[PDB]
Structure 1
Amino acid sequence: MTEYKLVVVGAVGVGKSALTIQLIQNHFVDEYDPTIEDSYRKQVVIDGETCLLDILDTAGQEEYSAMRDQYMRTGEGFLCVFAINNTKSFEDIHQYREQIKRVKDSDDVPMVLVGNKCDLAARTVESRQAQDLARSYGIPYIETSAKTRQGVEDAFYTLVREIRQH
């Protein structure tokens, strides 16, 4: 059983905890409680092999930014989340990518760009804007909804695969 160390990062309120909780526990949390740092664990089967997922759910609140360095050293792959109705979160993504790149001293860190809340009408960030960003980083882009489960397994398993195929 291979263990995979996944880390979920991005700005406040984009849906990091909701995505993680949907994946681990199969329900949607509608209340908002800001995270400091939570660790989760699940055994899953991906392409016919049993895997252990260690998932670190991190803080969007800028108050906790000094915790980043440690979790970026230890993490094997990063889910970089923004919300498609939150233009600022899409701008903030770039700062997470650069820190991870700096911390790990590598241009080749396993990562997936996620545009979350795709169930909501009247998006303010265009899919193509995120596609262009992902292309420049050399990483997959996937849209998700923690509320409807759209793309959620795909986003996390794609990240496991990026680590596995590295």
Structure 2
Amino acid sequence: EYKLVVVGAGGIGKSALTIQLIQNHFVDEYDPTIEDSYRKQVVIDGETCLLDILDTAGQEEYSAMRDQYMRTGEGFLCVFAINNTKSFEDIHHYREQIKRVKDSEDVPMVLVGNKCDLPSRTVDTKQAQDLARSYGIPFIETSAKTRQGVDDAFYTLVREIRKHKEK
């Protein structure tokens, strides 16, 4: 199973994106070794995927689990909101923490600019493309409200993980 982690500042749509992905892609699978014989699973681009959201503020200011999410995750959606400059400024620290915890210079990641439906844009596409280029990763704009780009962001992350697992 591919282990995907959605990371970013609070209030940017991480939960909204993940819920929309599950809604579109969950299936009920027959498994007679499980108690009730059926389990829900998310399948993305033919791969069974596990999904987790990493917040560090709010209730998660009190959590002991940040580094554990980073060690377990195999690929990361690094999310900001296009109407939240601070959330964009927060990206670098998240990426640096992931790289430090995983002790790897090759961590599958996709940069995601959410809320692209909103007219109040303070982070330009070019700013985000430049950041993604520096990191060597894809950038995609999404809206959980209108659904634009949501599947594409996760499908792209799955391909990034697949390439990493190949070699």
- Could you tell me the TM-score, scaled by structure 1's length? 0.80
- Could you tell me the TM-score, scaled by structure 2's length? 0.80
The answer to whether the 8 Å contact 1:114/1:142 transfers is yes
Displacement of 1:16 in angstroms is 0.3
- Structure 2 vs 1, CA of residues 40 and 23 (structure 1 numbering), >3 Å: closer, same or farther? farther
The answer to whether the 8 Å contact 2:132/2:139 transfers is yes
SS in 2 for 1:159: helix
SS in 2 for 1:165: helix
Deviates more, 1:146-155 or 1:48-57: 48-57
The answer to whether the 8 Å contact 2:79/2:111 transfers is yes
Displacement of 1:85 in angstroms is 0.1
The answer to whether the 8 Å contact 2:113/2:140 transfers is yes
Displacement of 1:19 in angstroms is 0.2
- Structure 2 vs 1, CA of residues 21 and 45 (structure 1 numbering), >3 Å: closer, same or farther? closer
Q: Give matches, 1:1-166, under 5 Å.
A: 3-26=1-24, 43-44=41-42, 46-47=44-45, 63-64=61-62, 66-166=64-164
- Structure 2 vs 1, CA of residues 91 and 56 (structure 1 numbering), >3 Å: closer, same or farther? closer
1:87-138 CA distance string (max 9 Å, x none): 0000001110000000001111000000000000020000100000000101
The higher radius of gyration belongs to 2
- Matched residues in 2 for 1:62 and 1:72: separation? 14
SS in 1 for 2:144: coil
- Structure 2 vs 1, CA of residues 104 and 123 (structure 1 numbering), >3 Å: closer, same or farther? same
The answer to whether the 8 Å contact 2:45/2:158 transfers is no
The answer to whether the 8 Å contact 2:29/2:39 transfers is no
Deviates more, 1:65-74 or 1:33-42: 33-42
Displacement of 1:42 in angstroms is 6.0
Displacement of 1:157 in angstroms is 0.8
Q: How many residue pairs were aligned? A: 164
- Matched residues in 2 for 1:9 and 1:106: separation? 18
Q: List runs of 5+ in structure 2 lacking aligned partners.
A: none
Displacement of 1:26 in angstroms is 4.6
The answer to whether the 8 Å contact 2:77/2:110 transfers is yes
SS in 1 for 2:64: helix
Deviates more, 1:71-80 or 1:27-36: 27-36
Deviates more, 1:49-58 or 1:6-15: 49-58
Q: List runs of 5+ in structure 1 lacking aligned partners.
A: none
- Matched residues in 1 for 2:37 and 2:54: separation? 5
The answer to whether the 8 Å contact 1:84/1:125 transfers is yes
Q: Alignment RMSD, CA only?
A: 7.4
- Matched residues in 2 for 1:36 and 1:130: separation? 44
